[PDB]
mmCIF file of C-alpha atoms in Angstrom:
data_model
loop_
_atom_site.group_PDB
_atom_site.id
_atom_site.type_symbol
_atom_site.label_atom_id
_atom_site.label_comp_id
_atom_site.label_asym_id
_atom_site.label_seq_id
_atom_site.Cartn_x
_atom_site.Cartn_y
_atom_site.Cartn_z
ATOM 1 C CA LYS C 1 85.561 52.177 70.840
ATOM 2 C CA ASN C 2 83.239 52.202 73.996
ATOM 3 C CA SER C 3 85.308 54.543 75.600
ATOM 4 C CA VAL C 4 84.184 56.398 78.779
ATOM 5 C CA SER C 5 84.762 60.384 78.632
ATOM 6 C CA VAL C 6 86.609 61.588 81.707
ATOM 7 C CA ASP C 7 86.789 65.800 82.503
ATOM 8 C CA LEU C 8 90.264 66.389 83.863
ATOM 9 C CA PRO C 9 91.293 69.541 85.951
ATOM 10 C CA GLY C 10 92.991 72.369 83.385
ATOM 11 C CA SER C 11 90.119 71.875 80.967
ATOM 12 C CA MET C 12 90.846 68.274 79.476
ATOM 13 C CA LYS C 13 88.785 65.283 78.342
ATOM 14 C CA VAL C 14 90.638 62.087 78.228
ATOM 15 C CA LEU C 15 88.597 59.053 76.446
ATOM 16 C CA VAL C 16 89.358 55.582 78.790
ATOM 17 C CA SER C 17 88.206 52.148 77.001
ATOM 18 C CA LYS C 18 85.234 50.714 79.126
ATOM 19 C CA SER C 19 86.785 47.169 78.679
ATOM 20 C CA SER C 20 90.333 46.092 79.532
ATOM 21 C CA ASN C 21 92.471 44.360 77.224
ATOM 22 C CA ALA C 22 94.354 41.033 77.060
ATOM 23 C CA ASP C 23 96.907 42.356 80.191
ATOM 24 C CA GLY C 24 94.066 44.132 82.517
ATOM 25 C CA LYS C 25 95.305 47.819 80.893
ATOM 26 C CA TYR C 26 93.112 50.659 78.983
ATOM 27 C CA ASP C 27 93.607 52.256 75.720
ATOM 28 C CA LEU C 28 93.301 55.997 76.609
ATOM 29 C CA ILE C 29 93.264 59.144 73.618
ATOM 30 C CA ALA C 30 92.856 63.001 74.555
ATOM 31 C CA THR C 31 93.237 65.795 72.577
ATOM 32 C CA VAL C 32 94.330 68.784 74.162
ATOM 33 C CA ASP C 33 95.775 71.700 72.108
ATOM 34 C CA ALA C 34 94.904 69.771 69.156
ATOM 35 C CA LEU C 35 97.144 67.283 69.241
ATOM 36 C CA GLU C 36 95.862 63.917 69.110
ATOM 37 C CA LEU C 37 97.816 62.273 72.685
ATOM 38 C CA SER C 38 97.336 58.303 73.536
ATOM 39 C CA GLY C 39 98.669 55.675 75.841
ATOM 40 C CA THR C 40 97.881 52.886 78.468
ATOM 41 C CA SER C 41 96.494 52.681 81.527
ATOM 42 C CA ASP C 42 96.718 49.840 84.123
ATOM 43 C CA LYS C 43 93.634 51.935 85.765
ATOM 44 C CA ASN C 44 90.739 52.544 84.161
ATOM 45 C CA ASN C 45 89.141 55.729 85.344
ATOM 46 C CA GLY C 46 91.550 58.086 82.363
ATOM 47 C CA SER C 47 94.066 58.036 84.824
ATOM 48 C CA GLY C 48 97.976 57.620 82.952
ATOM 49 C CA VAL C 49 99.865 59.325 81.176
ATOM 50 C CA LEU C 50 99.148 59.913 77.108
ATOM 51 C CA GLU C 51 101.870 61.085 74.535
ATOM 52 C CA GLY C 52 102.088 62.848 71.379
ATOM 53 C CA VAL C 53 104.429 64.348 68.658
ATOM 54 C CA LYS C 54 103.935 68.079 67.441
ATOM 55 C CA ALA C 55 104.800 68.685 63.516
ATOM 56 C CA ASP C 56 107.854 70.446 64.488
ATOM 57 C CA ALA C 57 109.068 66.981 66.826
ATOM 58 C CA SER C 58 108.755 67.903 69.953
ATOM 59 C CA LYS C 59 107.534 65.449 72.212
ATOM 60 C CA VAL C 60 104.193 66.397 74.459
ATOM 61 C CA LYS C 61 103.698 64.383 77.219
ATOM 62 C CA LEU C 62 100.208 64.125 79.649
ATOM 63 C CA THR C 63 100.190 62.653 83.320
ATOM 64 C CA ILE C 64 96.627 62.414 85.085
ATOM 65 C CA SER C 65 96.994 61.209 88.669
ATOM 66 C CA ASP C 66 95.379 58.068 90.369
ATOM 67 C CA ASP C 67 92.428 60.221 91.499
ATOM 68 C CA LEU C 68 92.342 62.667 88.889
ATOM 69 C CA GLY C 69 93.168 65.438 91.070
ATOM 70 C CA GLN C 70 96.043 66.979 89.321
ATOM 71 C CA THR C 71 97.150 66.834 85.338
ATOM 72 C CA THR C 72 100.764 67.364 84.132
ATOM 73 C CA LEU C 73 101.263 68.245 80.581
ATOM 74 C CA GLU C 74 104.853 68.557 79.323
ATOM 75 C CA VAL C 75 106.150 69.651 76.453
ATOM 76 C CA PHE C 76 109.728 68.326 75.792
ATOM 77 C CA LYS C 77 112.409 69.076 72.830
ATOM 78 C CA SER C 78 112.773 66.408 69.961
ATOM 79 C CA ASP C 79 115.203 64.299 72.679
ATOM 80 C CA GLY C 80 111.889 63.830 75.321
ATOM 81 C CA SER C 81 114.541 65.409 77.666
ATOM 82 C CA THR C 82 114.953 69.319 77.267
ATOM 83 C CA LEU C 83 111.581 70.311 78.821
ATOM 84 C CA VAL C 84 110.229 73.364 77.010
ATOM 85 C CA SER C 85 106.906 73.706 78.929
ATOM 86 C CA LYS C 86 105.034 72.138 81.382
ATOM 87 C CA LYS C 87 101.639 73.404 83.028
ATOM 88 C CA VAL C 88 100.127 71.562 86.264
ATOM 89 C CA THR C 89 96.509 71.710 87.269
ATOM 90 C CA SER C 90 94.887 70.667 90.080
ATOM 91 C CA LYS C 91 91.208 69.906 90.671
ATOM 92 C CA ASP C 92 90.243 73.540 92.713
ATOM 93 C CA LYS C 93 91.459 74.888 89.257
ATOM 94 C CA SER C 94 95.116 75.945 90.733
ATOM 95 C CA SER C 95 97.326 75.748 87.946
ATOM 96 C CA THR C 96 101.436 76.633 87.529
ATOM 97 C CA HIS C 97 102.351 77.169 83.814
ATOM 98 C CA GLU C 98 106.107 77.690 83.157
ATOM 99 C CA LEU C 99 108.186 78.070 79.704
ATOM 100 C CA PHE C 100 111.653 77.217 80.053
ATOM 101 C CA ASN C 101 114.811 79.006 77.913
ATOM 102 C CA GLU C 102 117.464 76.512 76.676
ATOM 103 C CA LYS C 103 119.562 76.863 79.602
ATOM 104 C CA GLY C 104 116.696 74.770 80.880
ATOM 105 C CA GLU C 105 115.951 77.482 83.485
ATOM 106 C CA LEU C 106 112.459 79.649 83.947
ATOM 107 C CA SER C 107 111.367 82.046 81.399
ATOM 108 C CA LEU C 108 108.116 82.500 82.445
ATOM 109 C CA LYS C 109 105.865 81.337 85.499
ATOM 110 C CA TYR C 110 102.393 81.994 85.086
ATOM 111 C CA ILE C 111 100.350 80.630 88.669
ATOM 112 C CA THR C 112 96.485 80.721 89.240
ATOM 113 C CA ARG C 113 95.415 80.187 92.748
ATOM 114 C CA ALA C 114 91.638 78.342 93.655
ATOM 115 C CA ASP C 115 90.639 82.037 95.250
ATOM 116 C CA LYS C 116 91.522 83.251 91.250
ATOM 117 C CA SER C 117 94.277 85.218 92.000
ATOM 118 C CA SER C 118 97.142 85.132 89.970
ATOM 119 C CA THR C 119 100.957 85.871 89.575
ATOM 120 C CA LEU C 120 102.938 86.178 85.923
ATOM 121 C CA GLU C 121 106.714 86.202 86.349
ATOM 122 C CA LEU C 122 109.204 86.451 83.291
ATOM 123 C CA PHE C 123 112.567 86.158 83.653
ATOM 124 C CA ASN C 124 115.240 87.312 81.597
ATOM 125 C CA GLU C 125 118.034 85.801 80.358
ATOM 126 C CA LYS C 126 120.063 86.400 83.117
ATOM 127 C CA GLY C 127 117.837 84.362 85.192
ATOM 128 C CA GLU C 128 116.619 88.142 87.070
ATOM 129 C CA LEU C 129 112.688 89.273 87.439
ATOM 130 C CA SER C 130 112.039 91.364 84.084
ATOM 131 C CA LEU C 131 108.003 91.607 84.886
ATOM 132 C CA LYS C 132 105.652 90.512 87.404
ATOM 133 C CA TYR C 133 102.221 91.130 87.238
ATOM 134 C CA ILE C 134 100.144 90.043 90.319
ATOM 135 C CA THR C 135 96.085 90.233 90.613
ATOM 136 C CA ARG C 136 94.903 89.187 93.856
ATOM 137 C CA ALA C 137 91.231 87.602 95.046
ATOM 138 C CA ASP C 138 89.826 90.759 95.084
ATOM 139 C CA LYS C 139 90.802 91.908 92.042
ATOM 140 C CA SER C 140 93.562 94.272 93.207
ATOM 141 C CA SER C 141 96.954 94.358 91.067
ATOM 142 C CA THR C 142 100.508 95.020 90.766
ATOM 143 C CA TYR C 143 102.332 95.727 87.585
ATOM 144 C CA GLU C 144 106.065 95.899 87.114
ATOM 145 C CA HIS C 145 108.600 95.504 84.284
ATOM 146 C CA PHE C 146 112.182 96.386 84.677
ATOM 147 C CA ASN C 147 114.510 97.279 81.788
ATOM 148 C CA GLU C 148 117.172 95.644 80.696
ATOM 149 C CA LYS C 149 119.443 97.437 83.371
ATOM 150 C CA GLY C 150 116.769 95.681 85.742
ATOM 151 C CA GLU C 151 115.644 99.049 86.875
ATOM 152 C CA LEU C 152 111.586 99.746 86.849
ATOM 153 C CA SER C 153 110.623 101.161 83.864
ATOM 154 C CA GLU C 154 106.724 100.755 84.455
ATOM 155 C CA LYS C 155 104.835 100.038 87.349
ATOM 156 C CA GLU C 156 100.800 100.207 87.819
ATOM 157 C CA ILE C 157 99.691 99.345 91.577
ATOM 158 C CA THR C 158 95.434 98.868 91.440
ATOM 159 C CA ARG C 159 93.696 99.075 95.126
ATOM 160 C CA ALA C 160 90.736 96.510 95.861
ATOM 161 C CA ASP C 161 88.324 99.912 95.436
ATOM 162 C CA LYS C 162 89.641 100.462 91.669
ATOM 163 C CA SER C 163 91.808 103.644 92.511
ATOM 164 C CA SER C 164 94.888 103.383 91.130
ATOM 165 C CA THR C 165 98.550 104.785 90.437
ATOM 166 C CA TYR C 166 100.531 104.023 87.036
ATOM 167 C CA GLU C 167 104.031 105.705 87.020
ATOM 168 C CA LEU C 168 106.592 105.749 83.524
ATOM 169 C CA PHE C 169 110.167 106.178 84.163
ATOM 170 C CA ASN C 170 112.902 107.398 81.463
ATOM 171 C CA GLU C 171 115.465 105.032 80.211
ATOM 172 C CA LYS C 172 117.283 106.536 82.968
ATOM 173 C CA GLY C 173 114.957 104.400 85.130
ATOM 174 C CA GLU C 174 113.661 108.249 86.495
ATOM 175 C CA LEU C 175 110.248 108.526 87.281
ATOM 176 C CA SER C 176 108.866 110.758 83.888
ATOM 177 C CA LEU C 177 105.196 110.418 84.552
ATOM 178 C CA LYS C 178 102.546 109.391 86.854
ATOM 179 C CA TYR C 179 98.909 108.927 86.672
ATOM 180 C CA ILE C 180 96.364 108.994 90.061
ATOM 181 C CA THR C 181 93.429 107.289 89.355
ATOM 182 C CA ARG C 182 91.120 107.798 91.974
ATOM 183 C CA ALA C 183 88.456 105.861 93.164
ATOM 184 C CA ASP C 184 85.735 107.757 91.608
ATOM 185 C CA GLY C 185 87.174 107.622 88.245
ATOM 186 C CA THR C 186 89.083 111.310 88.541
ATOM 187 C CA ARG C 187 92.617 111.410 87.799
ATOM 188 C CA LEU C 188 95.983 113.678 88.973
ATOM 189 C CA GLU C 189 97.660 113.439 85.364
ATOM 190 C CA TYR C 190 101.497 114.682 86.051
ATOM 191 C CA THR C 191 103.876 114.737 83.375
ATOM 192 C CA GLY C 192 107.512 116.431 82.508
ATOM 193 C CA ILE C 193 108.579 115.147 85.912
ATOM 194 C CA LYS C 194 111.798 116.584 86.379
ATOM 195 C CA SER C 195 114.845 115.276 89.087
ATOM 196 C CA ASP C 196 113.558 118.178 90.836
ATOM 197 C CA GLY C 197 110.462 116.790 91.586
ATOM 198 C CA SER C 198 108.088 119.737 89.800
ATOM 199 C CA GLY C 199 105.890 119.439 86.682
ATOM 200 C CA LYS C 200 102.826 119.713 84.689
ATOM 201 C CA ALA C 201 99.984 118.693 86.309
ATOM 202 C CA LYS C 202 95.892 117.905 85.031
ATOM 203 C CA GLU C 203 92.739 117.082 87.126
ATOM 204 C CA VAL C 204 90.724 115.095 85.237
ATOM 205 C CA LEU C 205 87.055 115.829 86.737
ATOM 206 C CA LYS C 206 83.699 114.342 85.628
ATOM 207 C CA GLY C 207 83.060 116.624 82.982
ATOM 208 C CA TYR C 208 85.741 118.922 82.835
ATOM 209 C CA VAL C 209 89.927 119.248 83.251
ATOM 210 C CA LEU C 210 91.460 121.893 85.480
ATOM 211 C CA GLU C 211 95.337 122.474 84.421
ATOM 212 C CA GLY C 212 98.335 123.549 86.590
ATOM 213 C CA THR C 213 102.040 122.910 88.229
ATOM 214 C CA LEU C 214 103.434 120.262 90.635
ATOM 215 C CA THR C 215 106.153 121.688 92.824
ATOM 216 C CA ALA C 216 107.968 120.056 96.292
ATOM 217 C CA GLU C 217 105.166 120.334 98.440
ATOM 218 C CA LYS C 218 101.484 120.584 96.003
ATOM 219 C CA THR C 219 99.934 120.568 92.957
ATOM 220 C CA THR C 220 98.385 124.089 91.869
ATOM 221 C CA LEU C 221 95.596 123.901 89.766
ATOM 222 C CA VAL C 222 94.744 127.245 88.629
ATOM 223 C CA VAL C 223 91.630 128.743 86.385
ATOM 224 C CA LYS C 224 91.682 132.590 85.787
ATOM 225 C CA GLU C 225 88.870 134.962 84.204
ATOM 226 C CA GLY C 226 90.397 137.986 83.618
ATOM 227 C CA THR C 227 91.313 139.786 86.808
ATOM 228 C CA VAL C 228 90.608 137.082 88.885
ATOM 229 C CA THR C 229 92.750 133.539 89.603
ATOM 230 C CA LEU C 230 91.429 130.608 91.311
ATOM 231 C CA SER C 231 93.707 128.290 92.788
ATOM 232 C CA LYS C 232 92.677 124.580 94.036
ATOM 233 C CA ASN C 233 95.746 123.787 95.983
ATOM 234 C CA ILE C 234 96.512 119.969 96.959
ATOM 235 C CA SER C 235 98.673 118.783 99.353
ATOM 236 C CA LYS C 236 100.944 115.847 99.593
ATOM 237 C CA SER C 237 98.702 114.467 101.960
ATOM 238 C CA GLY C 238 95.891 115.491 99.201
ATOM 239 C CA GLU C 239 94.352 117.886 101.510
ATOM 240 C CA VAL C 240 92.637 120.432 99.198
ATOM 241 C CA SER C 241 92.747 124.132 100.044
ATOM 242 C CA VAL C 242 91.521 127.389 97.563
ATOM 243 C CA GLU C 243 93.073 130.957 97.142
ATOM 244 C CA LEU C 244 91.425 133.491 94.861
ATOM 245 C CA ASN C 245 93.378 136.863 93.930
ATOM 246 C CA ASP C 246 91.672 139.556 91.913
ATOM 247 C CA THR C 247 93.881 142.478 90.830
ATOM 248 C CA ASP C 248 90.815 144.289 90.062
ATOM 249 C CA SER C 249 91.248 147.212 92.127
ATOM 250 C CA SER C 250 87.841 148.814 92.397
ATOM 251 C CA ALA C 251 86.305 148.603 94.959
ATOM 252 C CA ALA C 252 82.716 148.107 93.347
ATOM 253 C CA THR C 253 83.788 144.796 91.778
ATOM 254 C CA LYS C 254 87.218 142.937 93.185
ATOM 255 C CA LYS C 255 86.623 139.745 94.809
ATOM 256 C CA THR C 256 87.775 138.416 97.808
ATOM 257 C CA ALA C 257 87.732 134.925 99.207
ATOM 258 C CA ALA C 258 87.722 133.349 102.657
ATOM 259 C CA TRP C 259 88.739 129.704 102.465
ATOM 260 C CA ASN C 260 87.233 127.296 105.234
ATOM 261 C CA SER C 261 89.179 124.396 105.458
ATOM 262 C CA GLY C 262 86.595 122.885 108.126
ATOM 263 C CA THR C 263 83.602 123.841 105.366
ATOM 264 C CA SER C 264 85.640 122.631 102.323
ATOM 265 C CA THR C 265 84.072 125.534 100.940
ATOM 266 C CA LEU C 266 85.859 128.994 99.184
ATOM 267 C CA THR C 267 83.093 132.137 100.215
ATOM 268 C CA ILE C 268 83.262 134.869 97.390
ATOM 269 C CA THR C 269 83.114 138.849 98.643
ATOM 270 C CA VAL C 270 81.964 141.526 96.544
ATOM 271 C CA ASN C 271 81.968 145.516 97.241
ATOM 272 C CA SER C 272 81.182 144.545 101.444
ATOM 273 C CA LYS C 273 78.802 141.359 100.252
ATOM 274 C CA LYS C 274 78.880 137.749 100.068
ATOM 275 C CA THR C 275 77.703 137.278 96.806
ATOM 276 C CA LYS C 276 78.618 132.839 96.316
ATOM 277 C CA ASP C 277 80.001 129.930 97.801
ATOM 278 C CA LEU C 278 81.958 127.527 96.124
ATOM 279 C CA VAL C 279 82.696 123.845 97.776
ATOM 280 C CA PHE C 280 85.663 121.307 97.169
ATOM 281 C CA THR C 281 83.363 118.451 98.020
ATOM 282 C CA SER C 282 85.414 115.369 99.074
ATOM 283 C CA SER C 283 83.870 113.294 95.897
ATOM 284 C CA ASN C 284 85.955 115.898 93.722
ATOM 285 C CA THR C 285 83.418 117.884 92.558
ATOM 286 C CA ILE C 286 82.670 121.739 92.587
ATOM 287 C CA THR C 287 79.353 123.570 93.665
ATOM 288 C CA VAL C 288 78.103 127.094 93.388
ATOM 289 C CA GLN C 289 75.830 128.446 95.332
ATOM 290 C CA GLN C 290 74.660 132.414 94.727
ATOM 291 C CA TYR C 291 73.731 134.851 97.852
ATOM 292 C CA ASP C 292 70.697 136.534 97.915
ATOM 293 C CA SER C 293 71.707 140.432 96.862
ATOM 294 C CA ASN C 294 72.062 141.606 100.300
ATOM 295 C CA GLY C 295 74.479 139.476 100.953
ATOM 296 C CA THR C 296 72.986 138.224 103.993
ATOM 297 C CA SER C 297 72.481 134.246 103.234
ATOM 298 C CA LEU C 298 72.490 131.430 100.417
ATOM 299 C CA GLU C 299 69.027 131.512 97.801
ATOM 300 C CA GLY C 300 67.966 128.613 95.879
ATOM 301 C CA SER C 301 70.210 125.768 95.830
ATOM 302 C CA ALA C 302 73.805 124.227 95.084
ATOM 303 C CA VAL C 303 74.605 123.324 91.518
ATOM 304 C CA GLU C 304 77.517 121.058 90.906
ATOM 305 C CA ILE C 305 79.809 122.438 88.354
ATOM 306 C CA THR C 306 80.127 119.954 85.031
ATOM 307 C CA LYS C 307 81.911 121.909 82.495
ATOM 308 C CA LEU C 308 85.370 124.334 83.338
ATOM 309 C CA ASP C 309 83.307 127.632 81.726
ATOM 310 C CA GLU C 310 80.806 127.048 84.649
ATOM 311 C CA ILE C 311 84.126 127.730 87.184
ATOM 312 C CA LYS C 312 85.495 131.028 85.093
ATOM 313 C CA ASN C 313 81.777 132.279 85.376
ATOM 314 C CA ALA C 314 81.770 131.679 89.009
ATOM 315 C CA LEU C 315 84.425 133.767 89.073
ATOM 316 C CA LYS C 316 83.248 137.252 87.041
#
């Protein structure tokens, strides 16, 4: 008829009649999630109660506060009293969304705040938290999923700098797999972890992947080329160290190397002459640079490694 359309918290609209009826009251109509709700308010601004009935006989109730700052959207069973669901939303767009089990307790609670952070909670038939997913205003987040025993089954923690840790547990609740994603996208992938702390390790860099092992004290990624084995060692605090071993006994060709932790540089020597510098940068890259044919000092420029063969080549 002659209605005014009013925008409501929670992305809903209501139509309220412009003209009061015989009793000073106003007709209200709203469509929410395809259901047409209707009511009658003694207010003329779109506040009041609207109600509807779904095809499965659920009753729906929309309550709009007097100043239009809040809406409450309730779904009941057919008695119109047993609460199935409830969504409360404020003008600042903070909102709580609740689902309720057949006991009338919460099975799900989802809260969004004004700063856009949010928490999702799921609860099993025991009333215990089975899943939690929080996101914060800086887009960091925590994900926890619990098995029927109530132990962790999966956990992912993401930071503001986009680094993250993903953890997966076996049916016994013990840590099986762990992925550490650095701020720059490079990854440490731990798999086949056993209860004694060891397992298989991969570092996924930009362009190539290193393989190795995890033990009690460090991760060791190994690159072997013929007689020469280069071992990249990351301690528990992420402090990188590098070893090189050459089983070539011939003095004309054998590779020695000296690791300088201050410079993050492995300097390779052949036949009493320096030959190349390998720099393990703080940005999870490797560069190689060659010394001159006299071993005096470096020549040309450093080249950032983009492929595993380039590491192998530097070891020939």
